[PDB]
Amino acid sequence: MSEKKQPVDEDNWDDDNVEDDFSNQLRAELEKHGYKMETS
């Protein structure tokens, strides 16, 4: 349906919220977290 302007113009995908939350935040998810308890 040509609306007179617009003709001119769950695999891995629900997780995308968690992943874009976790892009540069806890990128390993455990490999610091399992090793936090001996930092202090």
Binding site: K4, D9, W13
Partner: protein
């Protein structure tokens, strides 16, 4: 062996649809049209879909005494253009069946839009609509016989004014057609309201945000609301255009509700990217809010080739990276300048700071100033007091600065419990509900 079949069913197109429309339009007023006469939209878009062909149905049109049975059957039998589109006036002037004038000045003429030769017949379509606009002008100077142009041919007329649009666009712009439109408005303002002005007003904004910019303020004095919104499709994209306006008028909190409304009033299908491409620039206003969720709840993978900038852009929104900011800008700023996107590049930083202050504000009752100066990529405590005042900017949640040295003495705000603010609004909630009871009353009034 296929073309003898539209000789039957393309004949019964005009027989059933057009013959019933004209004959049942001759009486039984306002059931004259609009029970299968304005089946016109999809049955005649379908006529331009369902099926030499160009001279055949345009010869020998106006004959005599109503022998269109034989004449349309001649149009059937003949399958085995310079004066030709004017031949429905050159056989004789039409002289009878004034509901048929625009009907046969639309349905045979318009398939050249779908034939797409664009060179010799768009000026002939211009002439054919000079004839049909002569009908449009001469309905009130020379045709003082009965209504026949409001109740049927106004709903036909706005459609073929969209076809006017289809013709006028494919070569140039239109300026004379705008005062011509407002004259068409004056002969539809007080007598019988048609959309019409809203059709070429959608086109007005559509070519004007391309090329003229004074006219939203002229809409402001021109906002005859037209609450009929019968198709809801024209009204939907009307909200889309004016939501692009309020996005370029930088009105956002209105834009989110009215553009979510404009989306949820699209019942549309056909996932080529109509709803998707209109919806992307719709929720660009949510990119301008300062708040936007993850767009996984919005994507059709047919839009994916166009949103190859857009997903990384909303990643830049949820993050705050200036590298990602400028990189998405220069690299991925193509294909959106055709729609107009560069008002988010000035305030993507504002989007960053409002997302951050939303997270921190609902996260923290009290924060400190010279650590909220280091939550995001802030600059200084004077920049942080600055951005606390700019974080209020409208009336946000209570943040009093502890005005000696305690950085901020902010706390959370209360009394949304269940006390007076919801029952301050429930009068208006049930005001909406009684409006729907008026819809029930008019549901009874439909017969």
């Amino acid at each position: 062996p296929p073309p003898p079949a539209p000789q039957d069913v393309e004949m019964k197109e005009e027989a059933a649809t057009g013959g019933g429309s004209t004959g049942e339009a001759d009486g039984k007023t306002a059931a004259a049209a609009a029970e299968h006469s304005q089946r016109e939209l999809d049955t005649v878009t379908l006529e331009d879909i369902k099926e030499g062909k160009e001279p055949r149905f345009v010869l020998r049109a106006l004959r005599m005494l109503p022998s269109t049975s034989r004449r349309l059957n001649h149009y059937v039998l003949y399958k085995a253009l310079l004066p030709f589109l004017e031949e429905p006036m050159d056989t004789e002037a039409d002289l009878q069946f004034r509901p048929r004038t625009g009907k046969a000045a639309s349905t045979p003429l318009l398939p050249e839009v779908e034939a797409y030769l664009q060179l010799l017949v768009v000026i002939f379509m211009m002439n054919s609509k000079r004839y049909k606009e002569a009908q449009k002008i001469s309905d009130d100077l020379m045709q003082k016989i009965s209504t026949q142009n409001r109740r049927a041919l106004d709903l036909v007329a706005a459609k073929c004014y969209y076809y006017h649009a289809r013709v006028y666009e494919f070569l140039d712009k239109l300026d004379v057609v705008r005062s011509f439109l407002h004259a068409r408005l004056r002969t539809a303002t007080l007598r019988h309201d048609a959309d019409g002005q809203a059709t070429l007003l959608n086109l007005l904004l559509r070519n004007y945000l391309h090329y003229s910019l004074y006219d939203q303020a002229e809409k402001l004095v021109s906002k005859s609301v037209f609450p009929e919104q019968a198709n809801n499709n024209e009204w939907a994209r009307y909200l889309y255009y004016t939501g692009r306006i309020k996005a370029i008028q930088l009105e956002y909190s209105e834009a989110r509700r009215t553009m979510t409304n404009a989306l949820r009033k699209a019942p549309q299908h056909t996932a080529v990217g109509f709803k998707q491409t209109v919806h992307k620039l719709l929720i660009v206003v949510e990119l301008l809010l300062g708040e936007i969720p993850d767009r996984l709840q919005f994507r059709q993978p047919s839009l994916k080739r166009s949103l190859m900038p857009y997903f990384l852009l909303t990643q830049a929104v949820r993050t705050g990276n200036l590298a990602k900011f400028n990189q998405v800008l220069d690299q991925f700023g193509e294909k959106f300048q055709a729609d107009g996107t560069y008002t988010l590049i000035i305030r993507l930083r504002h989007n960053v700071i409002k997302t951050g202050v939303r997270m921190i504000s609902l996260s923290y009752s009290r924060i400190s100033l010279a650590d909220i100066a280091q939550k995001l990529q802030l600059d200084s405590p004077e920049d942080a007091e600055f951005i606390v005042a700019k974080a209020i900017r409208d009336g946000v949640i209570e943040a009093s600065i502890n005005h000696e040295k305690g950085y901020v003495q902010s706390k959370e705000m209360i009394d949304i419990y269940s006390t007076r603010e919801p029952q301050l609004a429930f009068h208006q909630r049930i005001s909406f509900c009684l409006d729907i009871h008026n819809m029930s009353v008019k549901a009874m009034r439909f017969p």
